[PDB]
Scaffold this active site. Structure first.
Site, PDB file in Angstrom:
ATOM      1  N   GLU A 212      42.555 -38.599  39.608  1.00  0.00           N
ATOM      2  CA  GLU A 212      42.135 -37.995  38.347  1.00  0.00           C
ATOM      3  C   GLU A 212      41.142 -38.873  37.610  1.00  0.00           C
ATOM      4  O   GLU A 212      41.388 -40.050  37.399  1.00  0.00           O
ATOM      5  CB  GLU A 212      43.356 -37.738  37.479  1.00  0.00           C
ATOM      6  N   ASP A 214      39.541 -39.039  34.069  1.00  0.00           N
ATOM      7  CA  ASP A 214      39.521 -38.506  32.712  1.00  0.00           C
ATOM      8  C   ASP A 214      38.241 -38.952  32.030  1.00  0.00           C
ATOM      9  O   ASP A 214      38.176 -40.041  31.456  1.00  0.00           O
ATOM     10  CB  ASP A 214      40.757 -38.936  31.927  1.00  0.00           C
ATOM     11  N   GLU A 217      39.327 -37.578  26.954  1.00  0.00           N
ATOM     12  CA  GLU A 217      40.567 -37.123  26.313  1.00  0.00           C
ATOM     13  C   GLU A 217      40.370 -37.517  24.877  1.00  0.00           C
ATOM     14  O   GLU A 217      40.163 -38.705  24.595  1.00  0.00           O
ATOM     15  CB  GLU A 217      41.781 -37.811  26.908  1.00  0.00           C
ATOM     16  N   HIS A 228      42.127 -42.769  37.194  1.00  0.00           N
ATOM     17  CA  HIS A 228      43.497 -42.901  37.712  1.00  0.00           C
ATOM     18  C   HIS A 228      43.492 -42.796  39.251  1.00  0.00           C
ATOM     19  O   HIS A 228      43.228 -41.717  39.782  1.00  0.00           O
ATOM     20  CB  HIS A 228      44.365 -41.731  37.253  1.00  0.00           C
TER      21      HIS A 228
HETATM   22  O1  LIG Z   1      53.295 -47.764  25.434  1.00  0.00           O
HETATM   23  N1  LIG Z   1      53.535 -48.803  26.319  1.00  0.00           N
HETATM   24  O2  LIG Z   1      54.818 -49.334  26.416  1.00  0.00           O
HETATM   25  C1  LIG Z   1      52.492 -49.329  27.092  1.00  0.00           C
HETATM   26  C2  LIG Z   1      52.542 -50.679  27.446  1.00  0.00           C
HETATM   27  C3  LIG Z   1      51.536 -51.248  28.214  1.00  0.00           C
HETATM   28  C4  LIG Z   1      50.466 -50.466  28.617  1.00  0.00           C
HETATM   29  C5  LIG Z   1      50.413 -49.119  28.247  1.00  0.00           C
HETATM   30  C6  LIG Z   1      51.417 -48.540  27.476  1.00  0.00           C
HETATM   31  O3  LIG Z   1      51.374 -47.210  27.129  1.00  0.00           O
HETATM   32  C7  LIG Z   1      50.785 -46.300  27.934  1.00  0.00           C
HETATM   33  O4  LIG Z   1      49.410 -46.266  27.582  1.00  0.00           O
HETATM   34  C8  LIG Z   1      48.635 -45.509  28.487  1.00  0.00           C
HETATM   35  C9  LIG Z   1      47.165 -45.653  28.094  1.00  0.00           C
HETATM   36  O5  LIG Z   1      46.969 -45.042  26.820  1.00  0.00           O
HETATM   37  C10 LIG Z   1      49.081 -44.032  28.478  1.00  0.00           C
HETATM   38  O6  LIG Z   1      48.383 -43.385  29.542  1.00  0.00           O
HETATM   39  C11 LIG Z   1      47.862 -42.085  29.218  1.00  0.00           C
HETATM   40  O7  LIG Z   1      48.895 -41.118  29.264  1.00  0.00           O
HETATM   41  C12 LIG Z   1      48.447 -39.813  28.950  1.00  0.00           C
HETATM   42  C13 LIG Z   1      49.657 -38.870  28.869  1.00  0.00           C
HETATM   43  O8  LIG Z   1      50.308 -38.904  30.110  1.00  0.00           O
HETATM   44  C14 LIG Z   1      47.379 -39.321  29.928  1.00  0.00           C
HETATM   45  O9  LIG Z   1      46.911 -38.043  29.505  1.00  0.00           O
HETATM   46  C15 LIG Z   1      46.240 -40.334  29.981  1.00  0.00           C
HETATM   47  O10 LIG Z   1      45.256 -39.986  30.942  1.00  0.00           O
HETATM   48  C16 LIG Z   1      46.799 -41.733  30.261  1.00  0.00           C
HETATM   49  O11 LIG Z   1      45.769 -42.691  30.269  1.00  0.00           O
HETATM   50  C17 LIG Z   1      50.595 -43.918  28.683  1.00  0.00           C
HETATM   51  O12 LIG Z   1      51.072 -42.623  28.364  1.00  0.00           O
HETATM   52  C18 LIG Z   1      51.367 -44.903  27.818  1.00  0.00           C
HETATM   53  O13 LIG Z   1      52.746 -44.901  28.160  1.00  0.00           O
END
Ligand SMILES: O=[N+]([O-])c1ccccc1O[C@@H]1O[C@H](CO)[C@@H](O[C@@H]2O[C@H](CO)[C@@H](O)[C@H](O)[C@H]2O)[C@H](O)[C@H]1O
Ligand SMILES: O=[N+]([O-])c1ccccc1O[C@@H]1O[C@H](CO)[C@@H](O[C@@H]2O[C@H](CO)[C@@H](O)[C@H](O)[C@H]2O)[C@H](O)[C@H]1O
Ligand SMILES: *[C@@H]1O[C@H](CO)[C@@H](O)[C@H](O)[C@H]1NC(C)=O
Ligand SMILES: [Co+2]
Ligand SMILES: [Co+2]
Length: 434
Positions: A212, A214, A217, A228
């Site tokens: 994927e 993106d 978004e 991804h």
């Molecule tokens: O929130 N955390 O504990 C965390 C810690 C360390 C790194 C990243 C964290 O959170 C995660 O951040 C990601 C990047 O913002 C998120 O990934 C996104 O998720 C959405 C929904 O699934 C997707 O549409 C995006 O393409 C993707 O990058 C992730 O959700 C989040 O847990």
């Protein structure tokens, strides 16, 4: 699933430009098709629903195979049911559309013909589009992205899917989504659990994984660019919690990276770059142009245009990384500073380049987030963290924002408009349209 014709299927037309290294662009004529999940699914020989609310017919669909044999997808009234309209090179997607029932959002694919998806090879090329996010508040995501779907929507691989791309079959992404009602020519009724907070959705025993990209978004507050990788590049079924993603209790599954190597300028410290009004570099109350370039090294470059003024992706400094190119150094600095290993675990930009070297399908969507309220995009996440935790703050929206029922009630007429898609070799898409 098969296709039925109780409701006609006419794909809203949409044009785009294919540009040449020699300086010209040529108009292409395509259309958009709505994903199968949004459709009425009913018995092949009657109007009896195979799926209704968030549960399957236990008689038509006692198992995945019998369900697909008994059931078909029908046509979509794009404007009146789904709030999807087009005009020339412009596509608008409404948020809440009230007809006989309430619909929320849409996921659409760009078609090459009435029965096939358009495939783009991103590597070596660039993709440009215009977007108006002015009517997207906190909690919404107008997304434009690519996924490694089959051009026929899976028909050639799975005989029991005869509906195909014409009816929006074959979706996959890096969440390995388990909310899909049909995967690989079979239903997903086995292990189905209705959502506690969404009257129309659930999670089945299978998911559909693939790479994927993106590109976009975003809403009026924040925007993110995120590749991804998956260990298998193209579409592949997964089993239960092995899928990972949003739809599993453990997000980190066996084949795809659901987080990606994301670039959100706000998250990286530039809180003045993108937002509503003239106090931001890019004013999200007005249309803007977004250009994304896939150099053959596997790195990704980005620039924006608004009012004829050009801005590269803003520079970021993160650990030992400094620059505005999304490259290996950025992605490994991000893991070091923000945490996590998903992106590198799944093979990073090297694995991702395997996807962009092949064909990918263009997806355009509008959604709200019944799992995390879009806080990962536009707020502080997790919500117990502060600005002192690196990468926790992704936008200025309250940590209370984005409750689906609330934003659906308060902002039903939210919408996103994507327009003027242009694609071709790096350096070509700013040239005159044909
Ligand atoms: O929130 N955390 O504990 C965390 C810690 C360390 C790194 C990243 C964290 O959170 C995660 O951040 C990601 C990047 O913002 C998120 O990934 C996104 O998720 C959405 C929904 O699934 C997707 O549409 C995006 O393409 C993707 O990058 C992730 O959700 C989040 O847990
Ligand atoms: O103002 N500029 O320097 C500029 C330069 C290059 C491109 C666009 C510019 O301004 C923007 O022009 C848009 C198109 O004319 C304006 O958007 C339109 O505004 C009208 C009136 O509000 C509205 O009816 C249209 O639907 C809308 O597209 C935009 O306001 C302006 O900033
Ligand atoms: C944000 O990015 C813009 C565009 O690169 C730049 O002009 C501005 O100075 C940056 N602001 C901050 C605080 O980094
Ligand atoms: Co199975
Ligand atoms: Co480079």
């Amino acid at each position: 699933q098969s296709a039925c014709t109780l409701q006609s299927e006419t794909h809203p037309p949409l044009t785009w430009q294919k540009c040449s290294s020699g300086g010209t662009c040529t108009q292409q004529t395509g259309s958009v098709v709505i994903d199968a999940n949004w459709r009425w699914t009913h018995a092949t020989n009657s109007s009896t629903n195979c799926y209704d609310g968030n549960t399957w017919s236990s008689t038509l669909c006692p198992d995945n195979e019998t369900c697909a044999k008994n059931c078909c997808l029908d046509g979509a009234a794009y404007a009146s049911t789904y709030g999807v309209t087009t005009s020339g090179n412009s596509l608008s997607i409404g948020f809440v559309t009230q007809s006989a029932q309430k619909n929320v959002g849409a996921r659409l694919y760009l078609m090459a013909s009435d029965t096939t998806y358009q495939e783009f090879t991103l590597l070596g090329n660039e993709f440009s589009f215009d977007v108006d996010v002015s009517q997207l508040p906190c909690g919404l995501n107008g997304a434009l992205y690519f996924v490694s779907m089959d051009a026929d929507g899976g028909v050639s691989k799975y005989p029991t899917n005869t509906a195909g791309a014409k009816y929006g079959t074959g979706y996959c992404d890096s969440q390995c989504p388990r909310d899909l009602k049909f995967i690989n020519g079979q239903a997903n009724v086995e292990g189905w659990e209705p959502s506690s907070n969404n009257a129309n959705t659930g999670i089945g025993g299978h998911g559909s994984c693939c790479s994927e990209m993106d590109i976009w978004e975003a809403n009026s507050i924040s925007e993110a660019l995120t590749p991804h990788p998956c260990t298998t590049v193209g579409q592949e079924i997964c089993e239960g919690d092995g899928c990972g993603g949003t739809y599993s209790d453990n997000r980190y599954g066996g084949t795809c990276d659901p987080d990606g190597c994301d670039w959100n300028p706000y998250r990286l410290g530039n809180t003045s770059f993108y937002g509503p009004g003239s106090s931001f570099t890019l004013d999200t109350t007005k249309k803007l142009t977004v250009v994304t370039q896939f150099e053959t090294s596997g790195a990704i470059n980005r620039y924006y245009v608004q009012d004829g003024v050009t801005f590269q992706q803003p520079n970021a400094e993160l650990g030992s990384y400094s620059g505005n190119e999304l490259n290996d150094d950025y992605c490994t600095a991000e893991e070091a500073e923000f945490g996590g290993s998903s992106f590198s675990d799944k093979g990073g930009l090297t694995q991702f380049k395997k996807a962009t070297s092949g064909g990918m399908v263009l997806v355009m969507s509008l959604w709200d987030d019944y799992y995390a309220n879009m806080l990962w995009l536009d707020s502080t996440y997790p919500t117990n963290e502060t600005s002192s935790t690196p990468g926790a703050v992704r936008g200025s929206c309250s940590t209370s924002s984005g409750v689906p029922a609330q934003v659906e009630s308060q902002s039903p007429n939210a919408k996103v408009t994507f327009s003027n898609i242009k694609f071709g070799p790096i350096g070509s898409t700013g040239n005159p349209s044909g």
